[PDB]
Amino acid sequence: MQPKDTPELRALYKSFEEESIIPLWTQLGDLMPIHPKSKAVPHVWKWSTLLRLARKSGELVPVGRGGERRALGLANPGLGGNAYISPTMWAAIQYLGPRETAPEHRHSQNAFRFVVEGEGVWTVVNGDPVRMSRGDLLLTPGWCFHGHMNDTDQPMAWIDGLDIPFSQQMDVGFFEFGSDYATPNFSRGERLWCHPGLRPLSGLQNTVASPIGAYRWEFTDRALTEQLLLEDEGQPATVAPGHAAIRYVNPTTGGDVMPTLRCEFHRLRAGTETATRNEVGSTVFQVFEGAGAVVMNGETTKLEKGDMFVVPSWVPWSLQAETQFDLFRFSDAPIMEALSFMRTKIEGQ
Amino acid sequence: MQPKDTPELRALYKSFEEESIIPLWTQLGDLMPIHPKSKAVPHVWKWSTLLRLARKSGELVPVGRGGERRALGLANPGLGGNAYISPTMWAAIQYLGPRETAPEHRHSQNAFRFVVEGEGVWTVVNGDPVRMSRGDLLLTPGWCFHGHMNDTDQPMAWIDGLDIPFSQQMDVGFFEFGSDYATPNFSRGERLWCHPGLRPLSGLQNTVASPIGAYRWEFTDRALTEQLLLEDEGQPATVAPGHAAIRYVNPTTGGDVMPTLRCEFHRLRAGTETATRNEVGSTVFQVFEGAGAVVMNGETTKLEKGDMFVVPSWVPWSLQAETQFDLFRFSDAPIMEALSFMRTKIEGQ
Amino acid sequence: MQPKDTPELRALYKSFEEESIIPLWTQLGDLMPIHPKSKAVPHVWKWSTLLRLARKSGELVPVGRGGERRALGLANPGLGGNAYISPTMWAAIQYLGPRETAPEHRHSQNAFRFVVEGEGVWTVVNGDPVRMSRGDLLLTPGWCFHGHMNDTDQPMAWIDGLDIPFSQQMDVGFFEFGSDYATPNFSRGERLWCHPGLRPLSGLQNTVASPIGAYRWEFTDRALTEQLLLEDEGQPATVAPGHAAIRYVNPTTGGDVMPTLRCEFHRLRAGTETATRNEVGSTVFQVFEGAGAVVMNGETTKLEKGDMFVVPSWVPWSLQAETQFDLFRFSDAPIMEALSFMRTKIEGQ
Amino acid sequence: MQPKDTPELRALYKSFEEESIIPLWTQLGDLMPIHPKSKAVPHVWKWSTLLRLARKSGELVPVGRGGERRALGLANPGLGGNAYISPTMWAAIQYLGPRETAPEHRHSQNAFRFVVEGEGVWTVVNGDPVRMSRGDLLLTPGWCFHGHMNDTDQPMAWIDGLDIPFSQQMDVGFFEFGSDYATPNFSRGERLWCHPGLRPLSGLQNTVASPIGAYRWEFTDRALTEQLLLEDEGQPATVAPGHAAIRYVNPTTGGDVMPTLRCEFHRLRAGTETATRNEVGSTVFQVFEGAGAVVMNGETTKLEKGDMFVVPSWVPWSLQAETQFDLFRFSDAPIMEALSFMRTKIEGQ
Ligand SMILES: [Fe+2]
Ligand SMILES: [Fe+2]
Ligand SMILES: [Fe+2]
Ligand SMILES: [Fe+2]
């Protein structure tokens, strides 16, 4: 029950408004909910829709007229018109036209670029050029200069993933503009850092983000194959039966690629059904290859190559593989884990 | 410039709305600002207003009719009607009437209670009772059961500080209800942990929040006196000339009281003027004793005993002491520092 | 069995000697023992012997003729004439005569001074003077300048504890000579750092050793009393029944006083018998007050006020209290724990 | 000067001997030296001597008659007959005959096996078999079961490196005996862990030693080539001009292979002369390929393929390359660094 509605109570409340006071006893229960109840909702975007809308944006939106920023943000229908896939993460399909380029800038917001279709584009990160091709993860960690250049007449699509919404809501955003279009097969970073178990004596200092600028498909694919093969041979490897998986890591530390974003890659055997999880924080998956479905809040959605979906905080989810089902994954878990808010419920346990 | 406004462009945009896509090239620059530009604004609340409105709430709002929740939230005028002092922090004046009590609950949100006026109330934290009096900091770290009981006919006011707005925006909130009104002079926690330099062999495990339930005024006052005294004697101690200061810490670790909130206490000699700082993240100060002013965005506001004010992200601020000027401080810095978003500009350097 | 003893085998072995080769197959099993088998043996020194020999050293050994170095090293009878209490630790009774002084030096070896009898001596540590009295722990962490001065006509005895034998065997030793006899009641370090739960904003950097120069008896005694009192009240506190105990810690970190040495203080209720432990590494106890015994390798030795004893690596030990039994303790455990060699067996578990 | 040599002084000293007391004032200065002065001396072993003595041991010392332990320990001439290369490290040339095997054991002492000549031997580590060939580093971290099996009629030589002397002097040694001769091309460990930048979701827990059982030559060689190539292109990479180098690391952490031993591999361009270093702790190098010399204490020794040498604590050293000069390196630095005893002087700086 509320206080008696009296002229004195109404005078009290008008003083409140005047003095920027909001009394706790008037607040709606879910200021402190029983468990996380996001304004973001579970949502799927179909690739066939996204690619068609991206191609059209290629025609209608040239460089000089918005073409420098040709990226289709996935907007969660529960987040009020904000171009946010979740309360922490921005995810967009960047569509880079034949021969297009972008100049250098840096920003405090952390970012990756996961290559969906195409080849022969380079993203240049602190002057070091990083070739892009299908299945590759590129990082452009916060405060690193990044521009790019298409070396080809072909378009490319990648997922443009950032902590923009966290950074916007929390007031951490900074931004600077920057000041040869070399096309090396591999970046300096990779040439130093992508030898397993080995660390240059010139890079003995730990870093906050990975110095690996590209995690190439070859290696991702090979790691996942080896886990399934080790499973066949009776050896521990996979995380769950038929479920091979890796986390992309900062090799100086063994932890996440960047302070705010975790990236992983999963492969499921045909037939695999994962146990239902509730996890704090939001995650986004993209179907890289294969066919299957997701269950979110008990609702099953079938999924095809390229489809993308978001699980907001604490929404119970699982995946079923119809064929071999390869998925790229990102989430805000490093944030929940750094601050001791992370929590996990699994149907098995 | 934007793409040509054509029937095809308008069809593209209507497909966007239908498919929950928001194109980057339509977005307003400050999705990624040049430096943090908060929606929260610098604001001061006068104690004499807050105490008068609190007393009236005591009369008008009894237990059974909202009295269990008698706390006046400081609402930032730039945060849209949300009861948030800043985008990360909730700060409220809790007004506890003669003999009032509250039962036990726990929530994932972290919290402290800093005692402004009054005595002989106990907050009971995981069954351990913590006496409260003026100048004391109490913690109720996340997921710890806490209720309270006034043992007296006198009211008490404290600052009720939490990471509610971070927790609400980020989807990390959990909440449980709980299931003798002992009145020990000191808590078990204090009796184990408040011997300088000494650690019980039964508490060798590090914790995520401090096991000290109260940081009593005596010690705070004594530490600040010693720094000014060491300054008089030519010995390094104070942070800046005439500026004594402490941070409240988790003694198992030496770091912050809780994962999301930093607390500190400052004492300035009469005459002291601090150098202008820009810092990422928001901070709140309360004047504990003395007289002076603040400068925020170049605007000077005079301050009296009890006044409270907020500096949102990157707003340049400094303090001037007219008399000896004691201030309690909290901020979301452990969040900015954990995620490598923290940044500092000082006018000296 | 060994290789055939042939002229060719003997020629092989003479080539070995010539070329500084020692073949594994000739080595005695205990190059890699089944469990630690120290050359150091369990040993007790009686205080009444040590004090009598110390007094005589006071008469016979004046300043100018060895008096600057008047310290009686406890030499383990199994360590070959080396002045080592154990393979890692040096422990000596320093006997400081009326009005004696020592000038400043520093060395990489870490050291403490635990005051057995006497008062009004100061050890000056990086120019900061630290009063000494019975029951106090002083640190002189490695590479810190330290000299001292007796301000009185009375002698003082303290335990002079160092990692000298580790440092000597491992080749880490460095040593420098240094370049007012102030007598403050408390040191600068203490005045900054001995306020429970509080950390100066001017000392936000973690250190490798404690910045607390003295851990005074008052606080040690009070902590131990509180644990026994909390035990009386049914509250968890003591490590084992009737067994109160603390660890001295570096307050910036919550870990050990210095990188190589751990210090602790135990109080046992009359009647308390501890469960038998095997622990890797050596430890030394001193009886501060009370009466009881120790069991080492099944052999019981009765103990009086001032007695000192060493438990080398893996020797099973326990303590029995006849009266209330207060003991100071040091060990090389931070070394075994840092390098993942630590191991513990308890008779309970 | 010493105390007066009196009958009373002699009685004092006889009481000392009786009571296991050694007085400080009688001790020789270098109990606490000015800088490290090892009993170990700089020493070189020639490969042509070591291989010839190893072959002869193959003839004279069969299995059943010492052949199970056919390893030639490098004994430092200053370490008193102890089979120690330095005060912390044991280094031996293990010579494994045609078709020989060894059963499983484990010990707390940490160990590696760096393959000098030969192929088709497997060391089986916790049931997982690790093929061995020239240039490969294998680990058998402490407390891991390890046996081996030669699958061939050819002998193999490897460097058998351990922290035996530290473990022996410090009392940390434990040892257990253990209870198909599979010959996989690659180990399970490698198949999980040797994909650059990728970490199995099933191995998210950090470990104290590397889970990589072999660091194969291919990758080592490729990393060193890339650094010299990046040097040619004007890009930062090498540690010093013409000096390419890597550290072998634990991929869960980015730190050293094991708690007590660091391993590295250096490649110098023909002509390269390194600046003189003093470093705390001992190191051992082996010439893998090429020709050059070392300078230790100002004394130059020419070096050929296979030669091995030790630099004890603080001995100034440098390397000159005549040809391209590849060297494998191990040291006790993780011990000096963990305990804050490490120190470095370089002639450049
Ligand atoms: Fe960008
Ligand atoms: Fe609460
Ligand atoms: Fe000393
Ligand atoms: Fe072994």
Side-chain angles (χ1 to χ4, degrees), chain A residues 2-178 181-349, chain B residues 2-178 181-349, chain C residues 2-178 181-349, chain D residues 2-178 181-349:
Chain A
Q2 283 291 314
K4 286 168 182 160
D5 187 14
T6 261
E8 295 78 6
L9 184 74
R10 286 191 294 278
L12 183 64
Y13 286 175
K14 157 147 143 196
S15 291
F16 291 160
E17 161 200 67
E18 282 165 358
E19 299 314 324
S20 309
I21 299 291
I22 300 181
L24 179 55
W25 64 84
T26 254
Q27 290 306 100
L28 279 71
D30 281 21
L31 195 66
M32 312 192 76
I34 302 289
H35 59 74
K37 280 167 204 200
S38 196
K39 296 184 188 192
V41 294
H43 195 90
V44 173
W45 287 258
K46 299 224 103 235
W47 175 245
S48 64
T49 302
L50 291 162
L51 178 58
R52 169 183 49 88
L53 291 184
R55 278 156 175 190
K56 179 64 69 209
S57 303
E59 299 174 30
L60 301 191
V61 180
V63 277
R65 295 279 220 152
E68 318 53 62
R69 288 171 307 158
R70 202 185 299 105
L72 325 193
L74 289 46
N76 199 289
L79 295 174
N82 283 299
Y84 302 172
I85 196 159
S86 86
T88 54
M89 294 182 303
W90 153 288
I93 301 305
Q94 180 111 33
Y95 195 77
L96 182 65
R99 289 257 144 35
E100 303 175 352
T101 67
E104 294 180 14
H105 68 223
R106 33 138 73 151
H107 38 67
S108 69
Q109 296 84 337
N110 298 284
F112 68 78
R113 307 179 164 194
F114 173 77
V115 182
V116 180
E117 296 293 354
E119 32 159 55
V121 180
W122 273 252
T123 294
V124 172
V125 185
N126 295 137
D128 177 22
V130 184
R131 184 171 56 79
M132 310 166 70
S133 68
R134 172 151 162 98
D136 298 343
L137 178 62
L138 271 79
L139 303 179
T140 64
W143 217 232
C144 292
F145 284 106
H146 56 282
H148 57 252
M149 101 254 340
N150 195 351
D151 191 62
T152 285
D153 274 311
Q154 297 312 294
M156 165 165 97
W158 70 79
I159 298 161
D160 178 51
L162 297 96
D163 60 22
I164 271 160
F166 181 82
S167 296
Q168 171 170 41
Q169 286 150 302
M170 299 303 112
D171 308 320
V172 299
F174 287 88
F175 187 109
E176 288 177 1
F177 299 96
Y181 287 136
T183 46
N185 250 255
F186 299 94
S187 44
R188 172 210 167 247
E190 307 178 63
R191 287 168 67 191
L192 276 184
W193 288 104
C194 294
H195 308 286
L198 310 183
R199 178 167 192 163
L201 302 192
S202 66
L204 295 178
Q205 175 73 12
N206 297 173
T207 57
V208 300
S210 180
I212 292 154
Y215 298 77
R216 299 203 180 268
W217 176 253
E218 303 83 274
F219 313 106
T220 304
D221 173 61
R222 207 175 290 128
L224 296 164
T225 291
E226 294 300 349
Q227 299 178 200
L228 291 179
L229 254 26
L230 289 165
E231 199 185 44
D232 292 334
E233 312 167 353
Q235 285 304 127
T238 57
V239 249
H243 186 165
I246 57 92
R247 183 167 293 172
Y248 300 84
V249 293
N250 172 351
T252 66
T253 245
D256 285 298
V257 286
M258 293 180 293
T260 50
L261 293 172
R262 165 166 305 165
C263 297
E264 295 187 342
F265 202 100
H266 288 69
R267 175 170 293 164
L268 289 53
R269 277 183 214 288
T272 303
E273 282 183 1
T274 71
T276 294
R277 288 164 168 273
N278 295 253
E279 287 169 325
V280 171
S282 58
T283 192
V284 173
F285 283 88
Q286 183 252 13
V287 180
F288 185 69
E289 193 59 75
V294 228
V295 189
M296 302 196 276
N297 286 155
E299 167 181 11
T300 302
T301 299
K302 271 187 188 218
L303 258 19
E304 298 174 71
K305 181 176 172 149
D307 294 352
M308 288 188 70
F309 69 84
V310 57
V311 194
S313 201
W314 213 240
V315 164
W317 66 275
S318 48
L319 283 159
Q320 300 84 24
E322 176 181 292
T323 67
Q324 200 198 257
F325 201 24
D326 292 8
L327 318 87
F328 170 70
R329 198 199 180 173
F330 49 120
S331 73
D332 55 29
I335 305 178
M336 314 306 163
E337 302 170 18
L339 308 167
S340 292
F341 281 122
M342 181 64 70
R343 202 143 124 196
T344 293
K345 206 213 281 286
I346 311 166
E347 106 181 80
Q349 284 82 121
Chain B
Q2 283 291 314
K4 286 168 182 160
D5 187 14
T6 261
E8 295 78 6
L9 184 74
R10 286 191 294 278
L12 183 64
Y13 286 175
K14 157 147 143 196
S15 291
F16 291 160
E17 161 200 67
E18 282 165 358
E19 299 314 324
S20 309
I21 299 291
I22 300 181
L24 179 55
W25 64 84
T26 254
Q27 290 306 100
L28 279 71
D30 281 21
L31 195 66
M32 312 192 76
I34 302 289
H35 59 74
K37 280 167 204 200
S38 196
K39 296 184 188 192
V41 294
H43 195 90
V44 173
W45 287 258
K46 299 224 103 235
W47 175 245
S48 64
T49 302
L50 291 162
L51 178 58
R52 169 183 49 88
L53 291 184
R55 278 156 175 190
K56 179 64 69 209
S57 303
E59 299 174 30
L60 301 191
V61 180
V63 277
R65 295 279 220 152
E68 318 53 62
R69 288 171 307 158
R70 202 185 299 105
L72 325 193
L74 289 46
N76 199 289
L79 295 174
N82 283 299
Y84 302 172
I85 196 159
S86 86
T88 54
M89 294 182 303
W90 153 288
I93 301 305
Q94 180 111 33
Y95 195 77
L96 182 65
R99 289 257 144 35
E100 303 175 352
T101 67
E104 294 180 14
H105 68 223
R106 33 138 73 151
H107 38 67
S108 69
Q109 296 84 337
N110 298 284
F112 68 78
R113 307 179 164 194
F114 173 77
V115 182
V116 180
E117 296 293 354
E119 32 159 55
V121 180
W122 273 252
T123 294
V124 172
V125 185
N126 295 137
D128 177 22
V130 184
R131 184 171 56 79
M132 310 166 70
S133 68
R134 172 151 162 98
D136 298 343
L137 178 62
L138 271 79
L139 303 179
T140 64
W143 217 232
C144 292
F145 284 106
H146 56 282
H148 57 252
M149 101 254 340
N150 195 351
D151 191 62
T152 285
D153 274 311
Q154 297 312 294
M156 165 165 97
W158 70 79
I159 298 161
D160 178 51
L162 297 96
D163 60 22
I164 271 160
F166 181 82
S167 296
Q168 171 170 41
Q169 286 150 302
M170 299 303 112
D171 308 320
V172 299
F174 287 88
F175 187 109
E176 288 177 1
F177 299 96
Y181 287 136
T183 46
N185 250 255
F186 299 94
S187 44
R188 172 210 167 247
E190 307 178 63
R191 287 168 67 191
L192 276 184
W193 288 104
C194 294
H195 308 286
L198 310 183
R199 178 167 192 163
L201 302 192
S202 66
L204 295 178
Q205 175 73 12
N206 297 173
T207 57
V208 300
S210 180
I212 292 154
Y215 298 77
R216 299 203 180 268
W217 176 253
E218 303 83 274
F219 313 106
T220 304
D221 173 61
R222 207 175 290 128
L224 296 164
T225 291
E226 294 300 349
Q227 299 178 200
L228 291 179
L229 254 26
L230 289 165
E231 199 185 44
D232 292 334
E233 312 167 353
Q235 285 304 127
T238 57
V239 249
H243 186 165
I246 57 92
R247 183 167 293 172
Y248 300 84
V249 293
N250 172 351
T252 66
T253 245
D256 285 298
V257 286
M258 293 180 293
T260 50
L261 293 172
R262 165 166 305 165
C263 297
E264 295 187 342
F265 202 100
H266 288 69
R267 175 170 293 164
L268 289 53
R269 277 183 214 288
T272 303
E273 282 183 1
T274 71
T276 294
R277 288 164 168 273
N278 295 253
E279 287 169 325
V280 171
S282 58
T283 192
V284 173
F285 283 88
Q286 183 252 13
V287 180
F288 185 69
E289 193 59 75
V294 228
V295 189
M296 302 196 276
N297 286 155
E299 167 181 11
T300 302
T301 299
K302 271 187 188 218
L303 258 19
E304 298 174 71
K305 181 176 172 149
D307 294 352
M308 288 188 70
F309 69 84
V310 57
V311 194
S313 201
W314 213 240
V315 164
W317 66 275
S318 48
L319 283 159
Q320 300 84 24
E322 176 181 292
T323 67
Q324 200 198 257
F325 201 24
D326 292 8
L327 318 87
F328 170 70
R329 198 199 180 173
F330 49 120
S331 73
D332 55 29
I335 305 178
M336 314 306 163
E337 302 170 18
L339 308 167
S340 292
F341 281 122
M342 181 64 70
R343 202 143 124 196
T344 293
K345 206 213 281 286
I346 311 166
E347 106 181 80
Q349 284 82 121
Chain C
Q2 283 291 314
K4 286 168 182 160
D5 187 14
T6 261
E8 295 78 6
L9 184 74
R10 286 191 294 278
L12 183 64
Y13 286 175
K14 157 147 143 196
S15 291
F16 291 160
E17 161 200 67
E18 282 165 358
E19 299 314 324
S20 309
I21 299 291
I22 300 181
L24 179 55
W25 64 84
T26 254
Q27 290 306 100
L28 279 71
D30 281 21
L31 195 66
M32 312 192 76
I34 302 289
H35 59 74
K37 280 167 204 200
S38 196
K39 296 184 188 192
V41 294
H43 195 90
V44 173
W45 287 258
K46 299 224 103 235
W47 175 245
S48 64
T49 302
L50 291 162
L51 178 58
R52 169 183 49 88
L53 291 184
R55 278 156 175 190
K56 179 64 69 209
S57 303
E59 299 174 30
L60 301 191
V61 180
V63 277
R65 295 279 220 152
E68 318 53 62
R69 288 171 307 158
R70 202 185 299 105
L72 325 193
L74 289 46
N76 199 289
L79 295 174
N82 283 299
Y84 302 172
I85 196 159
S86 86
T88 54
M89 294 182 303
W90 153 288
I93 301 305
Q94 180 111 33
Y95 195 77
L96 182 65
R99 289 257 144 35
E100 303 175 352
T101 67
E104 294 180 14
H105 68 223
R106 33 138 73 151
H107 38 67
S108 69
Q109 296 84 337
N110 298 284
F112 68 78
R113 307 179 164 194
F114 173 77
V115 182
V116 180
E117 296 293 354
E119 32 159 55
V121 180
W122 273 252
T123 294
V124 172
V125 185
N126 295 137
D128 177 22
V130 184
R131 184 171 56 79
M132 310 166 70
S133 68
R134 172 151 162 98
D136 298 343
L137 178 62
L138 271 79
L139 303 179
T140 64
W143 217 232
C144 292
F145 284 106
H146 56 282
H148 57 252
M149 101 254 340
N150 195 351
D151 191 62
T152 285
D153 274 311
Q154 297 312 294
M156 165 165 97
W158 70 79
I159 298 161
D160 178 51
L162 297 96
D163 60 22
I164 271 160
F166 181 82
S167 296
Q168 171 170 41
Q169 286 150 302
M170 299 303 112
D171 308 320
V172 299
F174 287 88
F175 187 109
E176 288 177 1
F177 299 96
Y181 287 136
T183 46
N185 250 255
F186 299 94
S187 44
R188 172 210 167 247
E190 307 178 63
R191 287 168 67 191
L192 276 184
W193 288 104
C194 294
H195 308 286
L198 310 183
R199 178 167 192 163
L201 302 192
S202 66
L204 295 178
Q205 175 73 12
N206 297 173
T207 57
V208 300
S210 180
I212 292 154
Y215 298 77
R216 299 203 180 268
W217 176 253
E218 303 83 274
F219 313 106
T220 304
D221 173 61
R222 207 175 290 128
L224 296 164
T225 291
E226 294 300 349
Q227 299 178 200
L228 291 179
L229 254 26
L230 289 165
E231 199 185 44
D232 292 334
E233 312 167 353
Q235 285 304 127
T238 57
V239 249
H243 186 165
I246 57 92
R247 183 167 293 172
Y248 300 84
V249 293
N250 172 351
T252 66
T253 245
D256 285 298
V257 286
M258 293 180 293
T260 50
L261 293 172
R262 165 166 305 165
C263 297
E264 295 187 342
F265 202 100
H266 288 69
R267 175 170 293 164
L268 289 53
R269 277 183 214 288
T272 303
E273 282 183 1
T274 71
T276 294
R277 288 164 168 273
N278 295 253
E279 287 169 325
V280 171
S282 58
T283 192
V284 173
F285 283 88
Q286 183 252 13
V287 180
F288 185 69
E289 193 59 75
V294 228
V295 189
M296 302 196 276
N297 286 155
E299 167 181 11
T300 302
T301 299
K302 271 187 188 218
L303 258 19
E304 298 174 71
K305 181 176 172 149
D307 294 352
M308 288 188 70
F309 69 84
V310 57
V311 194
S313 201
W314 213 240
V315 164
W317 66 275
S318 48
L319 283 159
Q320 300 84 24
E322 176 181 292
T323 67
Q324 200 198 257
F325 201 24
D326 292 8
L327 318 87
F328 170 70
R329 198 199 180 173
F330 49 120
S331 73
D332 55 29
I335 305 178
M336 314 306 163
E337 302 170 18
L339 308 167
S340 292
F341 281 122
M342 181 64 70
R343 202 143 124 196
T344 293
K345 206 213 281 286
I346 311 166
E347 106 181 80
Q349 284 82 121
Chain D
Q2 283 291 314
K4 286 168 182 160
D5 187 14
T6 261
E8 295 78 6
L9 184 74
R10 286 191 294 278
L12 183 64
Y13 286 175
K14 157 147 143 196
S15 291
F16 291 160
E17 161 200 67
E18 282 165 358
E19 299 314 324
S20 309
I21 299 291
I22 300 181
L24 179 55
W25 64 84
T26 254
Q27 290 306 100
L28 279 71
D30 281 21
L31 195 66
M32 312 192 76
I34 302 289
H35 59 74
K37 280 167 204 200
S38 196
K39 296 184 188 192
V41 294
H43 195 90
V44 173
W45 287 258
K46 299 224 103 235
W47 175 245
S48 64
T49 302
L50 291 162
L51 178 58
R52 169 183 49 88
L53 291 184
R55 278 156 175 190
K56 179 64 69 209
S57 303
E59 299 174 30
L60 301 191
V61 180
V63 277
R65 295 279 220 152
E68 318 53 62
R69 288 171 307 158
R70 202 185 299 105
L72 325 193
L74 289 46
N76 199 289
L79 295 174
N82 283 299
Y84 302 172
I85 196 159
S86 86
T88 54
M89 294 182 303
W90 153 288
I93 301 305
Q94 180 111 33
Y95 195 77
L96 182 65
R99 289 257 144 35
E100 303 175 352
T101 67
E104 294 180 14
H105 68 223
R106 33 138 73 151
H107 38 67
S108 69
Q109 296 84 337
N110 298 284
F112 68 78
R113 307 179 164 194
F114 173 77
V115 182
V116 180
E117 296 293 354
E119 32 159 55
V121 180
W122 273 252
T123 294
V124 172
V125 185
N126 295 137
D128 177 22
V130 184
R131 184 171 56 79
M132 310 166 70
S133 68
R134 172 151 162 98
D136 298 343
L137 178 62
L138 271 79
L139 303 179
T140 64
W143 217 232
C144 292
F145 284 106
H146 56 282
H148 57 252
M149 101 254 340
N150 195 351
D151 191 62
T152 285
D153 274 311
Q154 297 312 294
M156 165 165 97
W158 70 79
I159 298 161
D160 178 51
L162 297 96
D163 60 22
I164 271 160
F166 181 82
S167 296
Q168 171 170 41
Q169 286 150 302
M170 299 303 112
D171 308 320
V172 299
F174 287 88
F175 187 109
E176 288 177 1
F177 299 96
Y181 287 136
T183 46
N185 250 255
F186 299 94
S187 44
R188 172 210 167 247
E190 307 178 63
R191 287 168 67 191
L192 276 184
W193 288 104
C194 294
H195 308 286
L198 310 183
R199 178 167 192 163
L201 302 192
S202 66
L204 295 178
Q205 175 73 12
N206 297 173
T207 57
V208 300
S210 180
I212 292 154
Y215 298 77
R216 299 203 180 268
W217 176 253
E218 303 83 274
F219 313 106
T220 304
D221 173 61
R222 207 175 290 128
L224 296 164
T225 291
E226 294 300 349
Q227 299 178 200
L228 291 179
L229 254 26
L230 289 165
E231 199 185 44
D232 292 334
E233 312 167 353
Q235 285 304 127
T238 57
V239 249
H243 186 165
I246 57 92
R247 183 167 293 172
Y248 300 84
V249 293
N250 172 351
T252 66
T253 245
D256 285 298
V257 286
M258 293 180 293
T260 50
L261 293 172
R262 165 166 305 165
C263 297
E264 295 187 342
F265 202 100
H266 288 69
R267 175 170 293 164
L268 289 53
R269 277 183 214 288
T272 303
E273 282 183 1
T274 71
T276 294
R277 288 164 168 273
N278 295 253
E279 287 169 325
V280 171
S282 58
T283 192
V284 173
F285 283 88
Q286 183 252 13
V287 180
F288 185 69
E289 193 59 75
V294 228
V295 189
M296 302 196 276
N297 286 155
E299 167 181 11
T300 302
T301 299
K302 271 187 188 218
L303 258 19
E304 298 174 71
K305 181 176 172 149
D307 294 352
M308 288 188 70
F309 69 84
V310 57
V311 194
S313 201
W314 213 240
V315 164
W317 66 275
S318 48
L319 283 159
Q320 300 84 24
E322 176 181 292
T323 67
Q324 200 198 257
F325 201 24
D326 292 8
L327 318 87
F328 170 70
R329 198 199 180 173
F330 49 120
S331 73
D332 55 29
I335 305 178
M336 314 306 163
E337 302 170 18
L339 308 167
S340 292
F341 281 122
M342 181 64 70
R343 202 143 124 196
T344 293
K345 206 213 281 286
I346 311 166
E347 106 181 80
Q349 284 82 121

